[PDB]
Amino acid sequence: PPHGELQYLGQIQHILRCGVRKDDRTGTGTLSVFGMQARYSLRDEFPLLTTKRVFWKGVLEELLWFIKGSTNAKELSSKGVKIWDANGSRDFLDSLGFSTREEGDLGPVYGFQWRHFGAEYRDMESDYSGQGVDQLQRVIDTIKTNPDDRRIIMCAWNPRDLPLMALPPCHALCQFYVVNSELSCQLYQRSGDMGLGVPFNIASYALLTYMIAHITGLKPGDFIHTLGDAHIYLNHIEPLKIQLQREPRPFPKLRILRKVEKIDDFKAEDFQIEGYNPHPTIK
């Protein structure tokens, strides 16, 4: 059976051949294609890319960080994941006109949008309980009660709250699907970096599907990755050409060590990645 990561490497190939030059916000050149799709099976394996190492502690800890509804970068930083700190810095906030915000306040980012959507945002330490729509829980509720529902969605894109946040959501929305007791998830990503960010994103929503599947007593199905703007930076072309030559090694497996009945109740210790042996790194 064809390895799943080939789908990903195949998209790298398509961008090289058929991609065209396009500049990003900073004027940095990229080779870009508009619209793409990839399917990764979550059945008895976890699509964690083996041709280049993926940052798992970042994926796991960031997802738990989303579920807590935390907009505070410091709360994630204290766990060892620094990826959101740059956008929460005192200097960066001031440049955006946010000067009245304490350091670490990212605005109404993913965490806020997931649990509290529609609510009026003020600051990272405020209590939003009962305010706004809880999408994450409505998703879990709907999957339990009405699995045939076509309408299951979690949307982080809020035109109202856009100017209030550091950077707009890269994850626009995701849809869930249930058939024959299998839970599938499709993500719509407006933009992604195939060489840097995309592998990380695949891991996140694969993990999310695993988590929700556990709560709802379902088996992980396929994960569909939809990309609005698929691009590779021109500085990554050759090192990617080398990565393409590498043969993908078998995906690891993800284990939930205990039984969890609530999405909020998940802890980082409950997750174990076994059998993950990626290729060496590259410079």
Side-chain angles (χ1 to χ4, degrees):
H3 195 288
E5 184 165 2
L6 294 179
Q7 295 291 102
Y8 162 82
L9 301 170
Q11 290 180 325
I12 306 295
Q13 266 295 141
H14 184 74
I15 290 171
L16 294 171
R17 187 175 63 129
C18 291
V20 300
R21 188 224 168 79
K22 189 180 195 243
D23 295 317
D24 75 335
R25 317 199 55 70
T26 46
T28 307
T30 79
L31 209 63
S32 174
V33 167
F34 185 64
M36 295 195 97
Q37 194 168 77
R39 188 176 298 255
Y40 307 95
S41 176
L42 311 172
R43 306 173 185 77
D44 56 82
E45 62 181 340
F46 192 79
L48 195 61
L49 306 197
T50 63
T51 54
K52 178 192 257 283
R53 176 168 292 278
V54 181
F55 184 19
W56 168 251
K57 186 185 181 192
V59 169
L60 171 54
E61 206 70 53
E62 184 201 48
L63 185 57
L64 298 169
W65 178 66
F66 287 158
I67 296 171
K68 290 190 298 185
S70 177
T71 58
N72 184 17
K74 291 190 183 303
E75 206 178 326
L76 183 65
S77 193
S78 60
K79 309 292 177 175
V81 181
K82 304 290 179 287
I83 64 184
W84 277 94
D85 295 342
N87 303 270
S89 62
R90 189 85 286 281
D91 281 310
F92 185 70
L93 291 177
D94 299 337
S95 64
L96 301 171
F98 293 139
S99 176
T100 55
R101 288 184 187 166
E102 282 184 351
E103 186 172 75
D105 195 339
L106 300 163
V109 300
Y110 298 99
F112 184 70
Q113 300 298 342
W114 283 18
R115 318 309 300 265
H116 300 301
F117 188 98
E120 197 67 55
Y121 187 78
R122 290 291 299 173
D123 63 82
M124 54 184 198
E125 288 167 35
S126 302
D127 185 276
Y128 297 101
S129 305
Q131 293 182 254
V133 177
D134 193 335
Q135 303 190 86
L136 178 57
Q137 190 58 51
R138 274 191 194 182
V139 160
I140 299 164
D141 291 336
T142 303
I143 288 170
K144 282 183 67 182
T145 60
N146 303 112
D148 289 344
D149 187 77
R150 303 173 175 177
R151 290 177 184 173
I152 312 174
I153 303 290
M154 189 161 65
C155 187
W157 192 263
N158 193 345
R160 192 192 78 237
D161 292 340
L162 283 182
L164 284 174
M165 52 176 97
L167 183 149
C170 276
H171 322 135
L173 64 77
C174 65
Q175 177 171 16
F176 289 96
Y177 179 89
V178 187
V179 64
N180 297 323
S181 306
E182 291 191 344
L183 178 62
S184 284
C185 171
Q186 174 169 35
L187 166 63
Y188 187 94
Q189 196 175 322
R190 58 171 187 84
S191 164
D193 187 321
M194 299 293 291
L196 292 166
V198 163
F200 187 96
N201 292 288
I202 298 170
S204 271
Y205 284 81
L207 173 58
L208 175 59
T209 303
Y210 261 87
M211 292 168 80
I212 296 173
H214 187 89
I215 303 305
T216 58
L218 291 169
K219 290 164 287 187
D222 295 311
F223 167 65
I224 297 81
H225 189 232
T226 300
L227 267 167
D229 190 324
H231 58 90
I232 59 187
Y233 285 102
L234 302 177
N235 297 321
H236 298 355
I237 295 283
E238 285 305 312
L240 281 166
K241 275 184 178 174
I242 303 304
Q243 188 180 332
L244 286 180
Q245 293 178 54
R246 297 176 168 177
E247 181 173 309
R249 298 162 180 176
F251 279 138
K253 308 198 180 308
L254 179 59
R255 293 287 221 278
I256 317 293
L257 301 178
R258 73 181 170 99
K259 164 100 179 305
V260 186
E261 294 183 349
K262 296 265 183 64
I263 187 67
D264 310 86
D265 188 35
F266 270 112
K267 296 290 171 293
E269 307 89 55
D270 299 321
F271 298 98
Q272 176 182 283
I273 298 288
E274 63 186 55
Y276 184 52
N277 187 21
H279 284 266
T281 184
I282 174 165
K283 185 311 195 201

